[PDB]
Amino acid sequence: IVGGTSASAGDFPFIVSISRNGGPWCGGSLLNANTVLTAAHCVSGYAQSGFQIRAGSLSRTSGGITSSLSSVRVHPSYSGNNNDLAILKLSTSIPSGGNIGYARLAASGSDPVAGSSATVAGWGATSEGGSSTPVNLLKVTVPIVSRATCRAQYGTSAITNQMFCAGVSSGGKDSCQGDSGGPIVDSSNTLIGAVSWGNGCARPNYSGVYASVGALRSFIDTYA
Ligand SMILES: [Cl-]
Ligand SMILES: [Cl-]
Ligand SMILES: [Cl-]
């Protein structure tokens, strides 16, 4: 997260850090006791044994409850940046309670409205190409950017109906490397997406691009 602030305890009861080979990697969202939603690119074709999930903590390295993976299912239409979601099943079920909770999801067929305020959270770099990552969870609030404006930024084919965009024209507030797969929420804390991709981080006139939960609910509901 670039231009972020510290997440408070219980801000995103469902957020998970996804470590790989013991180091930072991605984020995720706990859908239920044995299931995490993340970005396909966080996991697709990698050794599953490499991943560890941690829930119920603002730290990625200590506290809360952890789990290895039992399986990984990518979106059936995952291709390049498109349909960038994956369902992980957990080896160890994680109960709700305390600072752990399950995500509520954007309605099927919903699409974030331009100018509405979204909040995105992670343990990614606080600058583009940053090699140091914060221990504690950061968050930033940025407005939804219209698909039409985002297509003017990235090209028509680049931004699909299963993506939405968010950011500020000026830059300076965005998700970055290490934030992939983690939650972006509407003003109500409903899960609207997962961190997916973009042109660098926090650049003027290049929105963050997110995999749309509203657009990809059949996949999520079928395998959660
Ligand atoms: Cl047009
Ligand atoms: Cl602006
Ligand atoms: Cl779907």
- Distance of CA 218 from the midpoint of ligand 3 (Å): 4
User: What ligand is nearest to the CA atom of residue 168?
Assistant: 2
Single-letter amino acid code for the residue at 216? L
Q: In the annotation, is 75 catalytic? A: no
Burial 161-197 (b: 16+ CB within 10 A, else e): ebbbbbbbeebebbbbbbbbbbbbbbeebebbbbbbb
**Which token pair is 117?**
């305020």
User: What ligand is nearest to the CA atom of residue 159?
Assistant: 1
Method of determination is X-ray
Task: Determine the Cα–Cα distance for residues 96 and 33; give it in Å rounded to an integer.
Answer: 7
Q: In the annotation, is 131 catalytic? A: no
Q: Please, which residues have CB less than 5 A from ligand 3, an ion?
A: 216, 218-219
**Which token pair is 129?**
């190409």
Structure-token match 């974030």, residue found = 112
Q: Which of 17, 19, 41, 175 is catalytic?
A: 41
Q: In the annotation, is 84 catalytic? A: yes
Task: Determine the Cα–Cα distance for residues 214 and 184; give it in Å rounded to an integer.
Answer: 12
Are 39 and 195 spatial neighbours (Cβ–Cβ below 8 Å)? yes
- Distance of CA 198 from the midpoint of ligand 1 (Å): 20
What the chain holds in terms of domains, given with CATH numbers, is 1-12+103-214 (2.40.10.10), 13-102+215-224 (2.40.10.10)
Are 216 and 83 spatial neighbours (Cβ–Cβ below 8 Å)? yes
Residues 6+ apart with CB under 8 A from 92: 65, 66, 67, 68
